[PDB]
Design a protein around this ligand. Sequence first.
Ligand SMILES: CC(C)(COP(=O)(O)OP(=O)(O)OC[C@H]1O[C@@H](n2cnc3c(N)ncnc32)[C@H](O)[C@@H]1OP(=O)(O)O)[C@@H](O)C(=O)NCCC(=O)NCCNC(=O)CCC(=O)c1ccccc1C(=O)O
Ligand SMILES: CC(C)(COP(=O)(O)OP(=O)(O)OC[C@H]1O[C@@H](n2cnc3c(N)ncnc32)[C@H](O)[C@@H]1OP(=O)(O)O)[C@@H](O)C(=O)NCCC(=O)NCCNC(=O)CCC(=O)c1ccccc1C(=O)O
Ligand SMILES: [Ca+2]
Ligand SMILES: [Ca+2]
Ligand SMILES: [Ca+2]
Ligand SMILES: [Ca+2]
Ligand SMILES: [Ca+2]
Ligand SMILES: [Ca+2]
Ligand SMILES: [Mg+2]
Ligand SMILES: [Mg+2]
Ligand SMILES: [Mg+2]
Ligand SMILES: [Mg+2]
Ligand code: NA
Ligand code: NA
Lengths: 484, 484
Amino acid sequence: TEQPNWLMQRAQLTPERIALIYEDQTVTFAELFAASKRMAEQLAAHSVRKGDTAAILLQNRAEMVYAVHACFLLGVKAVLLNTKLSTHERLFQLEDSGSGFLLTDSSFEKKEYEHIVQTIDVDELMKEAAEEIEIEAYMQMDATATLMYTSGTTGKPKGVQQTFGNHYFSAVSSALNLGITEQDRWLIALPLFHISGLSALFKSVIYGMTVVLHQRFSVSDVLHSINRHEVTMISAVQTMLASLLEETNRCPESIRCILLGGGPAPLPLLEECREKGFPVFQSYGMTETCSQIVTLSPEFSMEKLGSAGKPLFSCEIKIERDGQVCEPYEHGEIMVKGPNVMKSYFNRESANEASFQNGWLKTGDLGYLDNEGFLYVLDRRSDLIISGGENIYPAEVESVLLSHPAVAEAGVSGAEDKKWGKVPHAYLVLHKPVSAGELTDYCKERLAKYKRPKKFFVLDRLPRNASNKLLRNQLKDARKGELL
Amino acid sequence: TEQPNWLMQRAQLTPERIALIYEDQTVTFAELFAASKRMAEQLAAHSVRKGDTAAILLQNRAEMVYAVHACFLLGVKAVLLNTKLSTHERLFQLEDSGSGFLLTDSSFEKKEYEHIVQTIDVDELMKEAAEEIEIEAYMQMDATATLMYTSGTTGKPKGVQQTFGNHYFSAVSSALNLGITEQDRWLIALPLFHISGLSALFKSVIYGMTVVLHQRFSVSDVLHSINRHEVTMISAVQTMLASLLEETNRCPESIRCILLGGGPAPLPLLEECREKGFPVFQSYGMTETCSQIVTLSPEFSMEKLGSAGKPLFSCEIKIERDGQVCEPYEHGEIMVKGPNVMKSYFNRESANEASFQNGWLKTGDLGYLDNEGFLYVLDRRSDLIISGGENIYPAEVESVLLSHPAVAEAGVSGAEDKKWGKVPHAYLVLHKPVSAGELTDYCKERLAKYKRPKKFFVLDRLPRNASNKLLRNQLKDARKGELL
Ligand SMILES: CC(C)(COP(=O)(O)OP(=O)(O)OC[C@H]1O[C@@H](n2cnc3c(N)ncnc32)[C@H](O)[C@@H]1OP(=O)(O)O)[C@@H](O)C(=O)NCCC(=O)NCCNC(=O)CCC(=O)c1ccccc1C(=O)O
Ligand SMILES: CC(C)(COP(=O)(O)OP(=O)(O)OC[C@H]1O[C@@H](n2cnc3c(N)ncnc32)[C@H](O)[C@@H]1OP(=O)(O)O)[C@@H](O)C(=O)NCCC(=O)NCCNC(=O)CCC(=O)c1ccccc1C(=O)O
Ligand SMILES: [Ca+2]
Ligand SMILES: [Ca+2]
Ligand SMILES: [Ca+2]
Ligand SMILES: [Ca+2]
Ligand SMILES: [Ca+2]
Ligand SMILES: [Ca+2]
Ligand SMILES: [Mg+2]
Ligand SMILES: [Mg+2]
Ligand SMILES: [Mg+2]
Ligand SMILES: [Mg+2]
Ligand code: NA
Ligand code: NA
């Protein structure tokens, strides 16, 4: 039921091994444990207690890594907040998660959260003296460790409860797939508030593996850092991968794995990576599975071009249509099972009832298996748009647009975009006149920047079926004029 | 609470990878699952049912690997029988374990067991037609998978219940310690009825790693097999390591890990291996921990010479004397904890109550921890003699000797042996005269070869404490004459 705290045990086993490279800082596992314990001590002085929930709002920094581990050492659930959200979106997640604390810094406006939660500046925190405490020496396998919001298909996101067991099994199953050696070093340049970034911190302490951490993604900095630090592993969404190949015809020799996830990649990009020797491992995974649950090796990447691979060890996948399992190549809903699959959504009894069916999680994605069991994800959802690896839910964007008094009805769908893959376009029926600029200013207070419509169209009615349900796939073809 | 059957998933994932090389003949994971399923179907036709217990009595052969997996595919607990035991010793274990079946071959005297268990000849079995069955597609993590007998300190051994979860976590923790790559291959030339050998079969399917299986250990054949099949990993007890060093001064280039366990090694041997580049990882582990639980890497083998190393990830060790905490360097009983620790001894109420203390397992070994947490096991037991990595319990050997009509009292202690480490000597008080030849003939029917006393001595009294308990340590000193 329990394991020794991973960071604590890792510091006991290999104290001097490097845990984190960040800018000009190198942090050993012994130093990481000491810093996380000290932050935990300072948090306990601000009355944080075992069983509490603490939200984290930070850019990728060493201090963010300390805060996550410090929560674990106190027995406190960590809510990872997306730094690009508007205040309005964060406030809902602070309230819905039951967070009693917000750990952030001066680059965010702490004042507008004072009413809901006790706000703590991580940099001022670390300057304070505090009593020593007895830390939580054990992680309970079925306890919720972290919460991440996603799947806003009804208009508001759901908090995914990720257990310590989920994270352990994700890291173990990935190591069984990719192999692990003492020389491996993993570069993380995507957000730590997504499981793509955060999972590397759990791999780090479980494997005893260095993470090279970047605050932002810059191709030139990443190539320099790979060379300076002998990086062997790197995670990317397809936009990042495309930017890398835009920069160089050759992959750095030390890279043995580019773990690609977070949405579909254009086929010519995968073909060019294979032709030029970039060792891309395409993968399929989500917040609910605590990162990858299916991965595709480069040796199959051309024969199975388009596939996300096979399930990781201990994990399982099937394709069902209306509760009947599908034959090979027959399209249906992707359902997954495994020790890395989330406990449940937080405080969403009805969604949990619908999403789980006898131990399997319904993903809401459509796909098929070929006759050797390789997974092919079909890009057919209209309730989800993926831009630069960031999920966007039309129901959320439509809810915000409807709230404007000039707006009678609203529909949002994804438009092709050479850089971002897809971007949201808005389709409106209006009571009163309103310009695109007005609408964009109105959305800025309520939606993260990547969620706001890149184009607006005006219609007399939107396409609906006989049950009055919006037909989002038909928006791009309806009689419309562009709104300026 | 369950995982897909490891062999089934591994065959699904990498069917063409080599699972087993035996007499240089190759078995892929696809072929291994097919042979294991077919033997399971043949066993079901002999009325073997989910929930039964089957004992296995086989030398190291491919068919013994099939049998273990076939049991898993039927949901049957597998009792691994030591092939060196007398018929008498094996009959006790068949009855104690509740085995309904015995899976063996014509190398063994099957007629002796058919009064207690239904005996099945694996070679005859594989020639039979049988109907297809629905195999058990999942392994229950807390269900007992295998039973192995050990710890005969009361005079009869105890059956260790090893769960699927125990074997999974043993394999994962070892991979996290040693690293794992697609090129790794593991050579096993020690009995599959010990967990030293059996654990490699589970590493094999979980990692997707070839096992090179030898029926016996010959140094020249092991060396030829390493270079022929590019072996990288090999398991050994110290007698095996000494034979290797007598044969060659150079370790084969492909070997990256010699995993040493099963008892203490002479320090000049460990120093010589380090001097000549043999990558020896000394370890501490037992049946009850489903193999290694503490291991030491070559980089510390000089500075920590005599150490067993540090606990594997997820595992823990402490030292206690009289239930009190022991400071570093303070001697006490080694106690261990981890997901690889056995469920319990089978139907041994008093032993389970005495051996488990608040979630920790008392090992019966004495040791201490240095100020960096490295474990030093002190060779101090007199209730256990280790001969060539085989455990010998004086209580068992004394019981056999006492049952002889001429024998009034008996005490067995370990004598130094250059080749085997320790061999048993017997110390006897006699009712009537009896020769050493007659006692040896008597012991042939009741004890495995390595357990039989190599020398007998006759005394008028044996060393005993105030409560008339034998003081086995002091037998060596006693006033005695050799019995010819
Ligand atoms: C793609 C990223 C790196 C782009 O950010 P960046 O700021 O560098 O963009 P630039 O090219 O430099 O230009 C900045 C302008 O572009 C805007 N912008 C930035 N991001 C987006 C965006 N997503 N969509 C639309 N616009 C964007 C900026 O606002 C700016 O605009 P201007 O001011 O100039 O006008 C960055 O977005 C990024 O890091 N994306 C990745 C986020 C992510 O990690 N998603 C994955 C989520 N899914 C999961 O975590 C589960 C699957 C998983 O675990 C996984 C995923 C990937 C890899 C591995 C795994 C795994 O299994 O381990
Ligand atoms: C040491 C071995 C290989 C010796 O056997 P072998 O038959 O090859 O000996 P020879 O020198 O060739 O001479 C043959 C005659 O020698 C007699 N004899 C054989 N063995 C012994 C013995 N142990 N003691 C005394 N005499 C012996 C025979 O009479 C033979 O005569 P013939 O009949 O041939 O004419 C062999 O004994 C051996 O394989 N020992 C290892 C057993 C073992 O596996 N012990 C480990 C048990 N402990 C565990 O499994 C838990 C710890 C663990 O998991 C582990 C252990 C080691 C390494 C790694 C791990 C791990 O954690 O994964
Ligand atoms: Ca500053
Ligand atoms: Ca990672
Ligand atoms: Ca893969
Ligand atoms: Ca953005
Ligand atoms: Ca054993
Ligand atoms: Ca007890
Ligand atoms: Mg950038
Ligand atoms: Mg099996
Ligand atoms: Mg019978
Ligand atoms: Mg031999
Ligand atoms: Na691989
Ligand atoms: Na200590």
